[PDB]
Symmetry: C3
Subunit: 102 residues, 3 copies
Amino acid sequence: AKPANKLVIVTEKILLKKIAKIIDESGAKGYTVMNTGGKGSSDIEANIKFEILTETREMAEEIADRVAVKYFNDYAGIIYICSAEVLYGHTFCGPEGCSAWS
Amino acid sequence: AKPANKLVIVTEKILLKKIAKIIDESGAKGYTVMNTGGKGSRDIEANIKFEILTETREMAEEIADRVAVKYFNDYAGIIYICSAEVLYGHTFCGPEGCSAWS
Amino acid sequence: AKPANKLVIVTEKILLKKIAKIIDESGAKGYTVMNTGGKGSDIEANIKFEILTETREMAEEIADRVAVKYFNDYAGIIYICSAEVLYGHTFCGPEGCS
Ligand SMILES: Nc1ncnc2c1ncn2[C@@H]1O[C@H](COP(=O)(O)OP(=O)(O)O)[C@@H](O)[C@H]1O
């Protein structure tokens, strides 16, 4: 298993492409996105959630910091991080797989 | 980053507003919700998943207890909890922000 | 609370039933599935499963069977998170999760 940080961004749908570009520019290998609903701060609003598995904590925080500094003054959103282990993932773990041995 | 408990409730779609009402009454600061499918062990059923990040474990368990007692003896549903750290979140972290140096 | 492994499988939508069948055959008591989008190697419509298992070996058995059977030919990732189940009739049994 390969340790990963799972970065989660829940935010407004209109930032989809801008956030995807930031994800791509961080070096992350991919991302999953979904339509969600939410309340913050009749009442529910449509929003999107991104999930980005990253090899390092620093890549996850780069994406988070770049998103927040650029957009979170003006747009609703939260960003949080969970620990995960990747078991299978051609691009994430490379050709040796997620449980290569030395 | 601010430690959080991510409470997850997966249940029947007809309980959307009822469970939202409990979350709103609890003092949790927000929630995310999504349409899902699922099977339990009592084809795929239409259901909903809530995610509620809470500042304390006691709040998460209070929500969970209240939902479970009020509905889960009469309706299908599971509740679980994951550890998360919040990096950005106006409401969750408050005006202090998420103490980036912690 | 009862410790659980949350196995997450994100893959191509066409594998929905095939993966469901493997989950069911593993002993897992249930699963959740949702429609998502993803970019790996624009966004493509795909599906995400979440399966809570009582043991880590059951989670890895599902993962291994899925990957061997499908991941040479189909796009996908599989990862695992730690969770604790608070309420879950089948998952925790008649005594509850504690
Ligand atoms: N072991 C599990 N892993 C992932 N999701 C589950 C699991 N068990 C139940 N679920 C989800 O929770 C929903 C409610 O489950 P329920 O029908 O109450 O299960 P049970 O009757 O097995 O306790 C299911 O439709 C499914 O989406």
